[PDB]
Design a protein around this ligand. Structure first.
Ligand SMILES: C[N+](C)(C)CCOP(=O)(O)O
Ligand code: MET
Ligand code: NA
Ligand code: NA
Length: 502
C-alpha cells in the first residue's frame, strides 16, 4: 500500500482536505444568516461534541482498513462488521464524495475562471448607488454560468466557463495521477502555505476597509458578539452541525481514504487534532474575517446580512469583488481572492475524488492511472447535469453534502463504536498516538454524539418528507433519478469486486 512520506505532508494534506470553499464561502453565509455571534456558540459546541470525535473515528477507521489494503468504506464496514448490508451502507462512502465532487469541481472551475479574468483585467467596470455597483458583477456572474432571466430550468454556460472546467479537471487529474506522496503531498506542501499567506494578506487588507457606512471592525464585532436569544432556535444548531460536518470533510469518506494511507503504527490522534484545529483557524479567523467584515464595511450590518441571505455565491462572486472594485488596485485584490478560493477548492476536490480512485485501485485492482482517468471521466460526464440544469447543484448539495454526510457519520460511528465494540474502537484510536484522547471523549463518542445526530436526522426527516413529494420542477427529479442511478452503478461495482474476491 502507498503511504504518506512525512508527518508534515500528511498534516498539510489533511488540512488541504478540510480547508476549502466551505471556509471562505459557506461559513460566512451560515454565520451571517444565523445572527453572527449567536451562531458561534452552537458552532463551537458542535465542534467539540461532533467534529473532533468523528474526525478521530474516521482517522482510526481509515488507518485500520488501510493496514489491510482497504481505503474505502464498502470494504472497511465489512472488516468492522460482517454483513452484505454493511457493504451496501459502505456504498455511501463512494456515492457521497462522487456526487459532491461533481458540482464542487464545477464551482472550483468558476473560481479559476474568475481568477484568470481578474488577473488579465477583464471585469465589469462600475462608476454611489449600491445597485449600480453590484448589478454589473451580478450580470458578470450570470453571463459566466449562463443564468436565465426568469426562473428557467436551462442554463447556458459560456464557452469560456466550459473550457475552464476542462482545464480544472485536467489539473485535478495531473495532481491525482502522481499518487499519494508524490502527487497530493507535494502539492499540499505548497498550496497550503500559499493559501495561508494569501488569506492573511486579504484579512489585513479587508480589516483596513473603513467607510461612512461602517467598518470591517463592525463586521468582526457582529460576528464575535454573543447573542443568547438564538440559543432556543433549533435551526441555528442544525446549521452549525451541518457546517461542522461539511467543513471538516466528515461523512464524505474522504478523511477515511486519506487515513488509509497512514502507516499502521503512526499516530492519528495528534495529526487529526492538528488538522481539525488548522481547519477551524482557517474558518473562523480567516474565512470569517474577509467577506462579512467587508460587506458590513461598505453596506453596513443589516445590508450585509441581507446579502448573505440572498445567496451563497452572491457574497463571494458578486458583492466582494464589487466592493474591491471601489478600492485602489481592487481588481488585483479580487484576483488574489479567487486564486485563494481556487487553491482551497482544488485541495478538497482531489480529496473527494481520491475515495473513488482508491476503491478502483484496491477493490477492482486497477492501476492508479486508469482509476484516475476513469474517475475523471465519470465526474466530468456527470458534471454536464450540474452545468446545464438549473437547481441541480442545490439538489446534489442537499442530498449528498447535507443529509448524506450526517446520515453517513451516524452510520460509521454506530458501526465502529457500537457493533465493532466500544473498547476495541477506543484502543484502536489511541494506539500509536503521540498523545491520548481525553477519557471523557469515550463517553462522548458512545452516547452523546450518536444521540445528537439521531435527533437531528429525525427532525430533518420530519420536516422534509412532506416537501419532497410535492416539488414542481422537473430538473430536481432528473437529478434525483440520475444520482440514484449513480448509487446503483456503484453498488454494481462493489458487487463485481466482491465476486472477484471469491
Ligand atoms: C442481511 N441481508 C439479508 C440483507 C444480507 C445478508 O447477507 P449475508 O450476510 O448472508 O451474506
Ligand atoms: C470538497 S471536500 C468537503 C468540503 C471541504 N472540506 C470544504 O471545507 O470546502
Ligand atoms: Na481544500
Ligand atoms: Na473546511
Amino acid at each position: 500500500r502507498e503511504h504518506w512520506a512525512t508527518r508534515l505532508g500528511l498534516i498539510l494534506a489533511m488540512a488541504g482536505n478540510a480547508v476549502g470553499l466551505g471556509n471562505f464561502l459557506r461559513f460566512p453565509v451560515q454565520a451571517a444568516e444565523n445572527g453572527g455571534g449567536a451562531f458561534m456558540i452552537p458552532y463551537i459546541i458542535a465542534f467539540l461534541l461532533v467534529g473532533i470525535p468523528l474526525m478521530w473515528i474516521e482517522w482510526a477507521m481509515g488507518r485500520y482498513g488501510g493496514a489491510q489494503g482497504h481505503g474505502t468504506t464498502p470494504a472497511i464496514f465489512y472488516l468492522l462488521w460482517r454483513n452484505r448490508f454493511a457493504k451496501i451502507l459502505g456504498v455511501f462512502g463512494l456515492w457521497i464524495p462522487l456526487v459532491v465532487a461533481i458540482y464542487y469541481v464545477y464551482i472550483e472551475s468558476w473560481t479559476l475562471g474568475f481568477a484568470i479574468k481578474f488577473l488579465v483585467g477583464l471585469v465589469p467596470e462600475p462608476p454611489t448607488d449600491p445597485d449600480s455597483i453590484l448589478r454589473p458583477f451580478k450580470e458578470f456572474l450570470y453571463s459566466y454560468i449562463g443564468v436565465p432571466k426568469g426562473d428557467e430550468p436551462i442554463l447556458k454556460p459560456s464557452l469560456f466557463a466550459y473550457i475552464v472546467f476542462l482545464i480544472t479537471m485536467f489539473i485535478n487529474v495531473s495532481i491525482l495521477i502522481r499518487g499519494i506522496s508524490k502527487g497530493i503531498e507535494r502539492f499540499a506542501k505548497i498550496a497550503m502555505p500559499t493559501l495561508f499567506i494569501l488569506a492573511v494578506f486579504l484579512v489585513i487588507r479587508v480589516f483596513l476597509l473603513e467607510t461612512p457606512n461602517g467598518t470591517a471592525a463592525d463586521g468582526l464585532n457582529f460576528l464575535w458578539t454573543p447573542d443568547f436569544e438564538k440559543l432556543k432556535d433549533p435551526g441555528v444548531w442544525i446549521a452549525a452541525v451541518g457546517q461542522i460536518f461539511f467543513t471538516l470533510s466528515l461523512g464524505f469518506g474522504a478523511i477515511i481514504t486519506y487515513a488509509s494511507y497512514v502507516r499502521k503504527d503512526q499516530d492519528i490522534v495528534l495529526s487529526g487534532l492538528t488538522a481539525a484545529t488548522l481547519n477551524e483557524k482557517a474558518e473562523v479567523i480567516l474565512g470569517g474575517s474577509i467577506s462579512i467584515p467587508a460587506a458590513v464595511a461598505f453596506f453596513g450590518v443589516a445590508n450585509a446580512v441581507a446579502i448573505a441571505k440572498a445567496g451563497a455565491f452572491n457574497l463571494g462572486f458578486i458583492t466582494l469583488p464589487a466592493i474591491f472594485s471601489q478600492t485602489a488596485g481592487g481588481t488585483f485584490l479580487g484576483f488574489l481572492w479567487f486564486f485563494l478560493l481556487f487553491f482551497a477548492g482544488l485541495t478538497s476536490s482531489i480529496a473527494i475524488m481520491q475515495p473513488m480512485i482508491a476503491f478502483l485501485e484496491d477493490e477492482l485492482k486497477l492501476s492508479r492511472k486508469h482509476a484516475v482517468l476513469w474517475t475523471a471521466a465519470i465526474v466530468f460526464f456527470s458534471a454536464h447535469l450540474v452545468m446545464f440544469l438549473n437547481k441541480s447543484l442545490d439538489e446534489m448539495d442537499f442530498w449528498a453534502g447535507t443529509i448524506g454526510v450526517v446520515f453517513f457519520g451516524l452510520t460509521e460511528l454506530i458501526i465502529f463504536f457500537w457493533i465493532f465494540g466500544a473498547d476495541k474502537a477506543w484502543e484502536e484510536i489511541n494506539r500509536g498516538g503521540i498523545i491520548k484522547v481525553p477519557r471523557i471523549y469515550y463517553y462522548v463518542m458512545r452516547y452523546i454524539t450518536p444521540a445528537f445526530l439521531a435527533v437531528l436526522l429525525v427532525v430533518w426527516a420530519r420536516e422534509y418528507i412532506p416537501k419532497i413529494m410535492e416539488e414542481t420542477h422537473w430538473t430536481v427529479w432528473i437529478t434525483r433519478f440520475y444520482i440514484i442511478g449513480l448509487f446503483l452503478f456503484l453498488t454494481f461495482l462493489v458487487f463485481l469486486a466482491e465476486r472477484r474476491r471469491n
